[PDB]
Structure 1
Amino acid sequence: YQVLARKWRPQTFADVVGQEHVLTALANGLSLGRIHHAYLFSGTRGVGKTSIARLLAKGLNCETGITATPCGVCDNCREIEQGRFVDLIEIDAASRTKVEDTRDLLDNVQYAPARGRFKVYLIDEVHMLSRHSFNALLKTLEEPPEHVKFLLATTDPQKLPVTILSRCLQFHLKALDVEQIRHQLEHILNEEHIAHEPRALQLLARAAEGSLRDALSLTDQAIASGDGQVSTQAVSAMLGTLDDDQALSLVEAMVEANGERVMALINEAAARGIEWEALLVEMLGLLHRIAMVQLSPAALGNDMAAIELRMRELARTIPPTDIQLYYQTLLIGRKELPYAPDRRMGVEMTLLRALAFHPRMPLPEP
Structure 2
Amino acid sequence: KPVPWVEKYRPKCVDEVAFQEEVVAVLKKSLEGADLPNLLFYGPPGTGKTSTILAAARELFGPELFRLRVLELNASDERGIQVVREKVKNFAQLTVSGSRSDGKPCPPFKIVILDEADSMTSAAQAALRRTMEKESKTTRFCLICNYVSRIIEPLTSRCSKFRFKPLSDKIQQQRLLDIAKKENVKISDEGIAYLVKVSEGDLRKAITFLQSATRLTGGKEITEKVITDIAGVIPAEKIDGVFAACQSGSFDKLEAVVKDLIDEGHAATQLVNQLHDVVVENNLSDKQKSIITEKLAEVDKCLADGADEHLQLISLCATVMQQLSQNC
How do 1:49-198 and structure 2 match up within 5 A? 49-61=49-61, 76-77=62-63, 79=64, 84-85=67-68, 88-90=69-71, 92=73, 94=75, 100-107=86-93, 113-115=98-100, 116-125=105-114, 131=127, 135=130, 137-141=132-136, 144=137, 150-155=140-145, 158-159=151-152, 161=154, 165-166=157-158, 170-174=160-164, 176=166, 180=168, 182-191=169-178, 192-193=180-181, 194-195=186-187, 196=191, 198=193
What does 1:1-366 correspond to in 2, within 5 Å?
1=2, 3-30=4-31, 33-36=32-35, 38-43=37-42, 47-61=47-61, 76-77=62-63, 79=64, 84-85=67-68, 88-90=69-71, 92=73, 94=75, 100-107=86-93, 113-115=98-100, 116-125=105-114, 131=127, 135=130, 137-141=132-136, 144=137, 150-155=140-145, 158-159=151-152, 161=154, 165-166=157-158, 170-174=160-164, 176=166, 180=168, 182-191=169-178, 192-193=180-181, 194-195=186-187, 196=191, 198-205=193-200, 208=202, 212-225=203-216, 229-291=221-283, 321=285, 327-337=289-299, 338-339=301-302, 342-359=308-325
In 1: Cα distance, 2:271 partner to 2:234 partner: 7
In 1, Cα distance between the equivalents of 2:217 and 2:85? 42
| CA distance in structure 2 between the partners assigned to 1:217 and 1:120 by the alignment | 34
Kindly provide the amino acid, as one letter, of the partner of residue 60 in structure 1. L
With over 3 angstroms needed to count, the CA separation of the structure-2 counterparts of 1:91 and 1:135, relative to structure 1, is farther
**1:105 alignment partner, SS class:** helix
Matched AA of 1:344? H
Choose between structure 1 and 2 for higher RCO, CA contacts under 8 A separated by at least 6 residues: 2
CA distance in 1, matches of 2:320, 2:86: 56
The one-letter code sitting in structure 2 at the alignment partner of 1:40 is L
The alignment-based identity, stated in percent, is 13
CA distance in 2, matches of 1:27, 1:47: 19
Tell me how many residue pairs correspond in the alignment: 294
Gaps of 5+ in 1: 62-75, 292-319
Deviations 1:232-286 (A, max 9, x none): 4223324432112221232233334454443322222112212212213223323
Q: Which moved more, 1:150-159 or 1:50-59?
A: 150-159
The unaligned stretches of length 5 or more in structure 2 are none
Q: TM-score, normalised by structure 1?
A: 0.64
* Cα contact 1:89–1:121 (8 A) shared by 2: yes
Larger radius of gyration: 1
TM-score, normalised to structure 2, is 0.71
Q: Check conservation: 2:110, 2:139, Cα contact below 8 A.
A: yes
Q: Equivalents in 2 of 1:130, 1:254: separation in Å?
A: 49
